[PDB]
Design a protein around this nucleic acid. Structure first.
Lengths: 456, 456
DNA sequence: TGTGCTCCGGGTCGTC
DNA sequence: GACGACCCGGAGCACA
DNA sequence: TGTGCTCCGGGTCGTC
DNA sequence: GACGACCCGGAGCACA
């Protein structure tokens, strides 16, 4: 059932992989160490000629994807010898005995072992063109196909379900220290294990450090390429409810007016056209809200089209303790604006793909700690207060405000606030921030079309 | 006729070295570079199975003496391919095409090619115990035997007469730059060629630089170990005549008296016993002598037992132009003493082998340039004179002199000369020197037994 | 007479 | 040692 | 309780 | 990668 390595031109078809009980003498090793530009494989087999009892040990090895060098060792009838040679080479390169291979343990600077495999829409059309954008469906398809027709996928052979399961472990090992964000040399420790357990053909090019979140996807599709309408069960996992809204309903009228009237004058390189409007209701958020706090406002939050999945799936999160505190003017937290164009800027859309989303959201502010200058330790300066508000040269005025289901909507136009920071950078526009997702109820999700002034 | 490499376990006996016309597909390469500790060999063969027309190219290689690694390449019936592989590898490592191998040329950093071989005394008993000492017969025998029973002699196989002929070329290449004396990195250039053309098993120990004259002999015996009583035809090559002399003949009486009376008082750690006395008559020396010069003296010259062959064979030579002028107080030349123990010191004999020789010799001095201090440029200071005499604190006095066949014998005892060098080293004893072998007639050859005062 | 340009092929180096 | 990559100069050539 | 001592066996390195 | 050498520490042991 385990084939004689087709590269052994001397015993192909004319012999078979000797086997004894539940113990098969055939193995594929593999080791990849980005540090040393190592990406090696080592194959061993124990052969019995079909016709006679002639024995021999076959050894192939080289870089993954190349066929490398070989060694054919003739043992004649001394099988006892062949099993020494086989197990000797196996101990040499694995540092694991052949008899306790069931309990294998990869040694750094030695080879891992590898188990080889020898063998209707239930949603409104508006929500469907939404999930299609949130999950990049046209991409995950044209790329899922590109895997199905990639030969270099399995350069050592079809892997086993178990083997790939280990692929997800070491892939998630990377996922976790990147969802932590630490590239502090633990990215090497973990990536080497994924390339090791999951062979890759890089030719001789040094293998990459898998950092971006996109690269993480390609692998998922890869691993899947080795193993309830789709759109409808994507929606389910979000555990969030998104409902179209009528373009004349009271909410659309007011959320439009808010989006337009609060588009800042200094963000004059584009306008916005509210293509569609969606309600937002996430599990456990109503239960968890701190509705006792006053100064509740419906406020904007924008982000790259690329990231709206995670926001709806696990909610609006805060930076991890790894503390990449560079642009977080007021410390790790959940930022909101009372100008639409302020948050639309963080959608980072392009002329070609010119439709980002915006998250209106009820924010229990409480009493605001109002600050001209920025202080990344601001969460500590509350001294009992419940939010922080960076002050801007411009803001909507209370004269023009309105209320929608108990939250204050700060309709434009914006107006000069006379706020100036003598010591340093003065903010253009307010920036509200809370440090606890319990002060956040995701209430509306705009889908916006961007219109650029420049032509190129 | 060329055997299938016994190390090819898969085709031994069951196949033969394919051959076409006068062109045989079998080769032994070899390269040794002391600089890089390289001592490698490379074997290629082209095989045809006896039974079928199946073809294959066999390649063995590694360090000389080890069996190394191998590559067996199966070509099936595509002989046209096999000859490519064979000739490809051959071009790869020789940088010489296989078709013009007859005109082979070793490239530095590439492999040389190797042609493998696939297949009563006529003298007085006193002169015989003399040649026995001059040629180290007991040694050249017990060592000639040690070669006959040295297996590591030919680690790559029996060489051909032609191959060994090249061994003598590269051996003499060393002989000449050591008979020149230059170790100025040309010893490497030449030695590498001898080890290359003549394989050696050093294990992994870095091969030696062959410097001493003894090492040169071992090789001669080696090369001979790969390819008219002996004593009587040794004598012949010297082209010098050595005749016993009676222990009561007038010469023995006077040469004794000279040897004893002129043994210096400060050389008091030994005495001498004239075992035998031999006349000396060398071809062309009488004809060439400058007998017109006055102040002819019979003077001593001693030297290591090891070197008496060369002195009698080519005469008394002078240092080559390479000018190792370190102990040559008065410039390159032929030195003599008028004290026996002065020259007996340069025999460098040991308690165990305690019999050196001494060369009495007629020396046409002419007018002497007499010098307290030494001047290695003294040959230039003659200004017409024909010899130089370093002055000693002690010398035989003319009162006690005698003449023997027209040369002045300066019989002892020696006496203080009151000679003192204010500026530097004062010589203990006279040191006569001439710069032309035509002022030298080798007349007598003493054989002396040394007797040590110390016991250990 | 040279200047581009590609294509081959060796030399060195890097990985196994 | 076995390959494969990589760098790089020279052969041959089109073109002006 | 440790101190010699040899013998084995891995780790590293060097040559092909 | 394949070997072989070489270095070196630890296991086992005799001995006091």
């Amino acid at each position: 059932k385990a084939p004689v390595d087709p590269e052994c031109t001397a015993k192909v078809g004319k012999a078979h992989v000797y086997c004894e009980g539940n113990d098969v003498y055939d193995v594929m090793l593999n080791q990849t160490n980005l540090q040393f530009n190592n990406n090696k494989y080592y194959l061993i087999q124990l052969l019995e000629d079909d016709a006679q009892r002639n024995f021999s040990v076959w050894m192939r090895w080289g870089r993954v994807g190349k066929m490398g060098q070989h060694s054919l060792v003739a043992c004649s009838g001394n099988l006892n010898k062949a099993k020494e040679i086989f197990q000797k080479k196996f101990l040499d390169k694995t540092k694991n005995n052949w008899e306790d291979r069931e309990k294998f343990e990869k040694v750094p600077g030695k080879y891992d072992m590898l188990q080889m495999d020898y063998a209707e829409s239930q949603l409104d059309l508006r929500v469907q063109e939404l999930i299609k954008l949130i999950c990049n469906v046209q991409a995950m398809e044209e790329m899922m196909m590109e895997m199905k027709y990639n030969t270099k996928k399995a350069p050592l052979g079809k892997l086993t379900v178990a083997q790939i399961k280990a692929g997800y472990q070491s892939l998630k090992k990377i996922e976790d220290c990147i969802r932590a964000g630490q590239h502090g040399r633990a990215l090497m420790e973990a990536c080497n294990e994924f390339y090791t357990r999951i062979p890759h053909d890089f030719g001789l090019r040094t293998p990459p450090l898998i950092r971006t979140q996109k690269e993480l996807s390609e692998k998922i599709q890869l691993l899947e390429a080795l193993g309830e309408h789709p759109l409808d069960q994507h929606y389910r996992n979000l555990h969030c409810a998104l409902r179209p809204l009528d373009h004349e309903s009271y909410e659309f009228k007011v959320i439009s007016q808010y989006l337009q009237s609060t588009h800042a004058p200094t963000h004059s390189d584009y306008t916005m056209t509210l293509l569609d409007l969606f309600e937002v209701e996430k599990d456990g958020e109503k239960e968890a809200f701190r509705e006792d706090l006053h100064n509740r406002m419906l406020l904007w939050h924008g982000s790259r089209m690329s990231n709206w999945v995670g926001i709806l799936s696990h909610g609006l999160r805060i930076a991890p303790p790894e503390a990449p505190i560079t642009g977080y003017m007021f410390g790790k937290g959940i930022y909101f604006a009372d100008m639409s164009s302020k948050s639309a800027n963080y959608c980072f859309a392009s002329r070609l793909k010119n439709t980002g989303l915006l998250l209106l959201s009820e924010v229990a502010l409480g009493q605001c700690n109002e600050l001209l200058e920025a202080n990344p330790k601001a969460e500590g300066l509350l001294q009992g207060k419940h939010s922080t508000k960076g002050l801007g040269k411009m803001a909507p005025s209370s004269a023009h405000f309105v209320t929608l289901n108990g939250s204050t909507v700060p309709l434009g136009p914006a107006s000069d606030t006379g706020i100036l920071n003598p010591d340093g950078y003065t903010l253009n526009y307010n920036e509200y921030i809370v440090y606890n997702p319990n002060q956040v109820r995701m209430r509306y999700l705009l889908k916006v079309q961007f219109n650029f002034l420049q032509l190129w």
